[PDB]
Design a protein around this ligand. Sequence first.
Ligand code: A1CKX
Length: 133
Amino acid sequence: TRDQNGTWEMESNENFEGWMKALDIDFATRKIAVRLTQTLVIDQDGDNFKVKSTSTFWNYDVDFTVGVEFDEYTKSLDNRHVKALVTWEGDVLVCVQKGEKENRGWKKWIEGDKLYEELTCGDQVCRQVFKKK
Ligand SMILES: *C/C=C(\C)c1ccc(-c2ccccc2)s1
């Protein structure tokens, strides 16, 4: 299934600190951020997505259309300019962000009642699991 709609509460977070290090996030931010539980809110209608990632420490929102490239500034995360593109590989939603960092982007897919996420940058992969609230 491609239905990623919902409010998703984190269950598991693996190697988030490694992914942040690959993005060059400063020590202070990483040490706080790695402690925190995350929430993902996805609104999905056809190709049109609104995605919000939140903790007590950050709020990161992005809107996009599947299949349409968009220039984006990564704002409070690492303040970099990338060219982003989100597409379907089967029922895996795949984002590639072209720019200074290699292998940058993410993957999201559904397994039963849970949403699985990969965050990639450089040679780092962060693996996450969320349950549907
Ligand atoms: C689909 C998942 C996305 C877009 C994100 C998951 C964590 C993100 C993030 C942004 C800023 C600061 C920390 C984490 S975005």
